[PDB]
């Protein structure tokens, strides 16, 4: 199975201070897509059929 | 984005006040959070 996060992201390092820094998500570059996972239909069909 | 309305936002562009290195000055910075991370009140 293959899982991906299409949204290539930006880290924004805002400083709460004095030595403590919070990391915030910056603006997205590219398209707005949602994460997803792929499972080989053939592999899953046989695997389920062997379990049943 | 350019959304019909079935995308239900999901991603939120939040702006807020923040404490800087110094005590005196506030910080008006913005971030990005998922809908499952935030909740609106009233």
């Amino acid at each position: 199975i293959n899982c991906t996060r299409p949204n290539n992201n930006t880290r924004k390092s805002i400083r709460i201070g004095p030595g403590q820094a919070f990391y915030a998500t910056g603006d997205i570059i590219g398209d707005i897509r949602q994460a997803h996972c792929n499972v080989s239909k053939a592999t899953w069909n046989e695997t389920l059929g062997k379990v049943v | 984005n350019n959304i019909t309305d079935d995308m239900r936002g999901e991603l939120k562009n939040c702006s807020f006040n923040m404490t800087t290195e110094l005590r005196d000055k506030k910080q008006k910075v913005y971030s990005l959070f998922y809908r499952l991370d935030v909740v609106q009140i009233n």
Partner: antibody, heavy 132, light 106 residues
Framework: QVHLQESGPGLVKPSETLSLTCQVS????????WSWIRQPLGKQPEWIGY???????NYNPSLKSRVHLSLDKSKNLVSLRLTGVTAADSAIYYC??????????????????????????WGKGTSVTVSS | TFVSVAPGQTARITCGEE??????VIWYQQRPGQAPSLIIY??????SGIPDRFSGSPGSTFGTTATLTITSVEAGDEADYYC????????????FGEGTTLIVLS
């Protein structure tokens, strides 16, 4: 093919209803998309909106509550309507065929594909002066 | 805006804002006193009748403006060129970008 001919009044008083007609020749009005584009003197063309025979039809958000489009399948022509005209509507109105396309960038199942329109066949156009 | 290019050279035209997402830029050419004509739809796909001298920048580049390249500049190419931006991140543009006039130096 395909010949298009626009026809209108040419002069409109303010706060009135401008009516234009786009005579279509060489094709049917039912099997194609139709768009209107106006262009002021010395300005960039502004899209008014697109209309389809089935009933699919969208307008310009800036001129949404003032414009009205329709298609006559019996006479095979296009008709534009603009209520509440001012001096800003004084431009050259063109009628033009419209072909659709689909730009896919992500995974089609999740949507993330937007349909883009483009005009290929233009008409001569009609000049409309809305000066009181 | 104006762009003057020597005949036979290469002309380049910039229109609209910087790309924020995957685009599908539609180019149009307007001869003075005539109606606007289609040149390149879908970034760099030219329809029938249009020479391959006209090429457009691919709409997969993020952070760059749409670019129209015209090789073998001739006097007949001297006109107004407008562009229609279709970004996945921006709403539908009901207004063409500010056009650019091509000047043949002869």
């Amino acid at each position: 093919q395909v010949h298009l001919q626009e026809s209108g009044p040419g002069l409109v008083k303010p706060s009135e209803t401008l009516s234009l007609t786009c005579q279509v020749s060489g094709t049917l009005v039912r099997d194609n998309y139709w768009s209107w584009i106006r262009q002021p003197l010395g300005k960039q063309p502004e899209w008014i909106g697109y209309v389809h025979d089935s009933g699919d039809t969208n307008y310009n958000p800036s001129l949404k509550s003032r414009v009205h489009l329709s298609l006559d399948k019996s006479k095979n022509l296009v008709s534009l309507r603009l209520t509440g005209v001012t001096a800003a509507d004084s431009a050259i109105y063109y009628c033009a065929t419209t072909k659709h396309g689909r730009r896919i960038y992500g995974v089609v199942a999740f949507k993330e594909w937007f349909t883009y329109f483009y005009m290929d066949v233009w008409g001569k156009g009609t000049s409309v002066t809305v000066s009181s | 805006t104006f762009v003057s290019v020597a005949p036979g050279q290469t002309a380049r035209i910039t229109c609209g804002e910087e790309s924020l997402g995957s685009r599908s830029v539609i180019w149009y050419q307007q001869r003075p006193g005539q109606a606007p004509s289609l040149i390149i739809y879908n970034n760099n796909d030219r329809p029938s009748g249009i020479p391959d001298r006209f090429s457009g920048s691919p709409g997969s580049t993020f952070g760059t403006t749409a670019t129209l390249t015209i090789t073998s500049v001739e006097a007949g190419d001297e006109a107004d060129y407008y562009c229609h931006i279709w970004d996945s991140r921006r709403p539908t543009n009901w207004v063409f970008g500010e056009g650019t006039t091509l000047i043949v130096l002869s």
